Design a binder for this molecule. Structure first.
Ligand SMILES: NC(=O)c1ccc[n+]([C@@H]2O[C@H](COP(=O)([O-])OP(=O)(O)OC[C@H]3O[C@@H](n4cnc5c(N)ncnc54)[C@H](OP(=O)(O)O)[C@@H]3O)[C@@H](O)[C@H]2O)c1
Ligand SMILES: Cc1cc2nc(-c3nccs3)n(-c3ccc4c(N)nc(N)nc4c3)c2cc1C
Length: 157
């Protein structure tokens, strides 16, 4: 299975200045739970943003940099390489990867951040005419998680 994982706001903002625009611990927990024991494919900028591979999953970084060789990280240099990765593969970001992969993935696990943030990077437009809502679950709010959010699982029709 090839899936997208993304958090985007009401206007599809995903990032600002190479970081998340929001602080939402529950989204990180969501991502950790979904991808544990599986594979994440991410662009170079997303990797550098996180700073280190995420433990207990295969971390794959897509880059043109032939000098890229980081401990605990597997490198690929082509989109085509993604299709040779075994198991459940999650497209992890960022904008460039999402733009390249949205027409190719089987499904998407989206956290809709129900606010309007300043962004410099976006998830591409998509329509529910193409995507069946497998599930929609409202995120629970508390003092650590104060922005309304909804977890969608969308499957390509
Ligand atoms: N909200 C979310 O769900 C989420 C998740 C992840 C990231 N983000 C955000 O997304 C933003 C980053 O997105 P971005 O588009 O600027 O960067 P990105 O997608 O993370 O990385 C782009 C880089 O990936 C490499 N790349 C992409 N396609 C390639 C290809 N076909 N062949 C070879 N290399 C390829 C290139 O690296 P080289 O230049 O080294 O060749 C390119 O510069 C940040 O703000 C981050 O916080 C948000
Ligand atoms: C510990 C931890 C740190 C993280 N930092 C990020 C960043 N995303 C963008 C810049 S840094 N993220 C990410 C990365 C990619 C993500 C993605 N593709 N979808 C969703 N919904 N959340 C993400 C969150 C982290 C996730 C975890 C579990």
């Amino acid at each position: 299975t090839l899936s997208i994982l993304v958090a985007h706001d009401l206007q599809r903002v995903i990032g600002f200045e190479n970081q998340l625009p929001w602080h939402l611990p529950n989204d990180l927990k969501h991502v950790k739970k979904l991808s544990t024991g599986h594979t994440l494919v991410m662009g170079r900028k997303t990797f550098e943003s996180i700073g280190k591979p995420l433990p207990n999953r295969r971390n794959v970084v897509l880059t043109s940099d032939t000098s890229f060789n980081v401990e605990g990280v597997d490198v690929i240099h082509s989109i085509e390489d993604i299709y040779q990765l075994p198991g459940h593969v999650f497209i992890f970001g960022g904008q460039t990867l999402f733009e390249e992969m949205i027409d190719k993935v089987d499904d998407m696990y989206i956290t809709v951040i129900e606010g309007k943030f300043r962004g410099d990077t976006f998830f591409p437009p998509y329509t529910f005419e193409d995507w069946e809502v497998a599930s929609s679950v409202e995120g629970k709010l508390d003092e650590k998680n104060t922005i309304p959010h909804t977890f969608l699982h969308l499957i390509r029709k």
